[PDB]
């Protein structure tokens, strides 16, 4: 009993597209224009961010084709840097990052779904929390039932969000083709090079939030059909399409709303729909919520698989990484992920942990690519069907180092708090993983708990 290989190229493309296209494209442009000033500067920032993301996606595609095992961005560190850094990353990932991200996406979905009912007065939180919890529970139940259903849902919602973006593109083209625009040929008016790079890089930073999630396919490798060919092809198909769609969407946004209207807006898509439709203007927010819905699925699935891998190496209790003999799904991992995600509904400052951990992704990516180069240097005997030309990873590493330096520059105090939280993961490693000769009264308790969970869920250990 193992996890069947039932993810095709189309499913991988859908996963990447649905993960990347979330809610960033509907909110971030306000911040990008605020930190850039001129529309042309914003457009060039978005193009540069797209190129940077394409470079990183190619690097990760080659790396994941070299090491074909699930739990990516964590298995690479486990193989290269050893066990302790891998556990240090995994503890933070399962403790703060994943549940907070999933809950934030669920809250965005809940708030944008209910927006037409309360167009001006804010949506009550006591209902948004319930809607988010219902979404999380329904998606985790769907994932627990079967794997094919999750892929079908992801495909449908990726198609839905692509259709919404296409609708925005057509609306922008209709607006621009009917006559005067006066917002595109004077594009460098108010070209703010404020503090020169001292602000320009910050603009780039904002764009990066819209280009996040291209590495979530590596989480679900060794579950694809012929990964050696499909893994790079999916990324190659996905990334340029996303970049082009983002650029066209920004152009359509600029063809309708003035600069002062944009900087005074909290949701550019809502204003665009209000202007261009008037009646049936609720279409634009609803789709946005639907988009977030898909994102939640695209998270939970991957998250579960990560924890699955986390239990195969002994870094997590053995109850995880156990498969239902009939459904062939990791029920305990999904249940644990859902419980951890729902546990964050009591946090009234959920929008701060993201600020606490903003350098953690770039550091992990840089470490993974450094391990890529070191593994290429020391072990020139592995199979590499794809081999990116050198001097590309070193430039990406330099960019990641500059990015983490910028992240420290922006907000140092909670970056230090994040360092402390990360360092807090050593005692748990030394107690659970390092300490083998445990007292006899603890092994029996753990065994009884695992047996009870097995009997409740009807899950068997993985056999190869």
């Amino acid at each position: 009993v193992t996890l069947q290989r039932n993810i095709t190229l189309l499913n991988g493309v859908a996963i990447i597209v649905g993960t990347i296209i979330g809610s960033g494209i509907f909110v971030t442009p306000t911040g990008v224009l605020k930190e850039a000033g001129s529309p042309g500067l914003a457009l060039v920032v978005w193009a540069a961010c797209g190129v940077f993301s394409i470079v990183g996606a190619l690097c990760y595609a080659e790396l994941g084709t070299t090491i074909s095992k699930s739990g990516g961005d964590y298995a690479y560190m486990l193989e290269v840097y050893g066990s302790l850094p891998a556990f240090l990353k995994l503890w933070i990932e399962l403790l703060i990052i994943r549940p907070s991200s999933q809950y934030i996406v669920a809250l965005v979905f809940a708030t944008y779904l209910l927006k037409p009912l309360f167009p001006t007065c804010p949506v009550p939180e006591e209902a948004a929390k319930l809607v988010a919890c219902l979404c999380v529970l329904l998606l985790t139940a769907v994932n627990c039932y079967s794997v094919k259903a999750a892929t079908r849902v992801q495909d449908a919602f990726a198609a839905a969000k692509l259709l919404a973006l296409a609708l925005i593109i057509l609306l922008g083209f209709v607006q621009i083709g009917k006559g005067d625009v006066s917002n595109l040929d004077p594009n460098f008016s108010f070209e703010g090079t404020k503090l020169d790079v001292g602000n320009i890089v910050l603009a780039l930073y904002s764009g990066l939030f819209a280009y996040g999630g291209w590495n979530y396919l590596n989480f679900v490798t060794e579950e694809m059909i012929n990964p050696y060919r499909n893994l790079p092809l999916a990324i190659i198909i996905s990334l340029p399409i996303v970049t082009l769609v983002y650029v066209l969407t920004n152009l359509a946004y600029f063809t309708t709303l003035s600069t002062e209207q944009m900087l005074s807006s909290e949701a550019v898509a809502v204003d665009f729909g209000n202007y261009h439709l008037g009646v049936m203007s609720w279409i634009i927010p609803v789709f946005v919520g639907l988009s977030c819905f898909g994102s939640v699925n695209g998270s939970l699935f991957t998250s579960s698989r990560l924890f699955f891998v986390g239990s195969r190496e002994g870094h997590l209790p053995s109850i995880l990484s156990m498969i239902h003999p009939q459904l062939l799904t990791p029920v305990p991992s999904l249940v644990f992920t859902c419980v951890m995600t729902l546990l964050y509904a009591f946090s009234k400052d959920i929008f701060s942990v993201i600020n606490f951990f903003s350098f953690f992704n770039w550091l992990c990516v840089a470490l993974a690519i450094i391990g890529m180069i070191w593994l290429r240097h020391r072990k020139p005997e592995l199979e590499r069907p794809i081999k990116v030309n050198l001097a590309l990873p070193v430039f990406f590493i330099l960019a990641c180092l500059f990015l983490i330096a910028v992240s420290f520059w922006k907000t140092p105090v909670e970056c230090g708090i994040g360092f402390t939280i990360i360092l807090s993961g050593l005692p748990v490693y030394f107690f659970g993983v390092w300490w083998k000769n445990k007292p006899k009264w603890l092994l029996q308790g753990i065994f009884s708990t695992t047996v009870l969970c097995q009997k409740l869920m009807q899950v068997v250990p993985q056999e190869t």
Binding site: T120, A127, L134, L456
Partner: protein
């Protein structure tokens, strides 16, 4: 490597009593999901609804800027109509939503037969230059209102001739200027126009006959409330700028009484708040009260209208040999050629633009807040009693940040004594509130401040805020 295998689990987990619990827990999970959905639905249904917007126009959003004499605005030099393109950027800085240009038509003297409102006076420029200015202003999201007062050079606004000819000429002028692309009109000194009510109503009708985003402004000099009200008996959507407010109402109680009486008499309709029709604030106020009145006019329920130079406090009593109606703007220390050196550094726009405690910075902050906050945009207004000489009121629209303005018009320090006890429970003031700004430097910004021990320095204003809490 910790737990049973497939065979042992199959043996020990298939007995009855272990398969019943799984189905029971599944049913419990689904029932809990249904209950959560029902709770969310009943919470959503049993919630207060939003309040519909009042369909604000373009002149309902911010302040109006008046440029009386066009020659003196650009300082000493050419007063060509295109020069405004160099100064227009500044209007955006001030975040003004309008611009009332002075009369720019041909005007020889009191002879009506030679004066026409159709042709632009050659000194100011040409029609093409005006069209370029209008297009540039429209591209900058700033509207232009054209003053159509026939006899502005002469002492009398009209020619003291028979009215009907002048009325026909001006009504012909409105059509042509509307076709040109102006966004509004203004007429001043209507007290010298007999039967002005009918003419004003007809001009409003012909202005609204083009579009619903067209504005007409009338100006008087009468401070009598009944005389002001008689003009608006037949007109509902007319902005009447008058000297009603500036009637030596230095004391706070008289000003509060005037404001409340006017708002009650007009039926809480939309109005225009200004001290005069063509005069600066300094012409009616001492230098110690300019900040207080600027804080007042940016929070009252209406459109604030300011003359040019009111953001930095010009006056005609500091530079001798100047007209009382057309002071020269102080752009720099070289603004005034005569007495070369009388102009200091703090009386110029560039000096105040870098000082964080000048009139210009306060004006910019107030204009930014007024044109962005919904409560200040179209919120309900309620003034409540306070100490002997304090004007205290609150602005609150539906659920946004409620604003509380307290002004001390007395010349000595005094407490607050904010005993309302009559405001509706939807906007009851709490124990603590923030602090956006104060007229006199010396108070920290942003820090919450208790409103029980409020001490006010002489001639001070406060702009506290507090969120909505049912």
């Amino acid at each position: 490597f910790t737990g049973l295998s497939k065979e042992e689990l199959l043996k020990v987990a298939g007995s009855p009593g272990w398969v019943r619990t799984r189905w029971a827990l599944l049913l419990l999970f689904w029932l809990g999901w249904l209950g959560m959905l029902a709770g969310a639905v009943v919470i959503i249904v049993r919630a207060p609804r939003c309040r519909e917007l009042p369909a604000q126009k373009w002149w309902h959003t911010g302040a109006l800027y008046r440029i009386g004499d066009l020659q003196a605005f650009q300082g000493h030099g050419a007063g060509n109509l295109a020069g405004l393109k160099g100064r227009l950027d500044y209007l955006s800085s001030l975040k003004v939503k309008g611009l009332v240009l002075g009369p720019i038509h041909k005007n020889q003297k009191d002879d009506v037969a030679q004066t026409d409102l159709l042709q632009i006076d050659p000194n100011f420029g040409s029609k093409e230059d005006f069209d370029s200015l209008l297009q540039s202003a429209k591209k900058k999201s700033i509207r232009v209102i054209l003053d159509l007062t026939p006899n502005y050079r002469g002492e009398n606004s009209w020619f003291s001739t028979q009215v009907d000819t002048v009325a026909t000429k001006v009504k012909d002028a409105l059509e042509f200027w509307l076709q040109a692309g102006v966004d509004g009109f203004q007429v001043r000194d209507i007290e010298n126009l007999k039967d002005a009510s009918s003419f004003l109503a007809e001009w409003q009708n012909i202005t609204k006959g083009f579009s619903e985003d067209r504005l007409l402004i009338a100006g008087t000099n009468s401070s009598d409330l009944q005389q002001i009200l008689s003009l608006l008996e037949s007109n509902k959507d007319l902005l009447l700028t008058s000297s009603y407010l500036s009637d030596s109402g230095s004391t706070g109680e008289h000003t509060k009484s005037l404001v409340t009486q006017y708002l009650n008499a007009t039926g809480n309709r939309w109005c225009s708040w200004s001290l005069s029709q063509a005069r600066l604030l300094t012409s009616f106020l001492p230098a110690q009260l300019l900040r207080l009145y600027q804080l007042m006019l940016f929070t009252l329920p209406g459109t604030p209208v300011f003359s040019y130079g009111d953001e930095i406090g010009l006056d005609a009593a500091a530079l001798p040999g100047q007209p009382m109606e057309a002071p020269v703007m102080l752009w720099d220390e070289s603004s005034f050629p005569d007495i070369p050196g009388a102009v200091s550094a703090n009386m110029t726009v560039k000096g105040q633009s870098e000082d964080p405690g000048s009139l210009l910075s306060l004006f910019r902050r107030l204009s930014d807040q007024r044109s962005k906050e919904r409560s200040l945009l179209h919120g309900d207004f309620h003034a409540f009693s306070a100490g002997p000489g304090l004007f205290s009121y609150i602005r609150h629209w539906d659920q946004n940040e409620r604003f509380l303005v307290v002004l001390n018009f007395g010349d000595v320090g005094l407490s607050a004594g904010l005993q309302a006890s009559d405001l509706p429970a939807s906007a009851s003031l709490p124990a603590k509130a923030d602090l956006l700004l104060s007229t006199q430097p010396g108070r920290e910004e942003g820090s919450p401040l208790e409103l029980e021990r409020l001490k006010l320095e002489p001639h001070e204003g406060l702009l506290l805020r507090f969120p909505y809490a049912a």
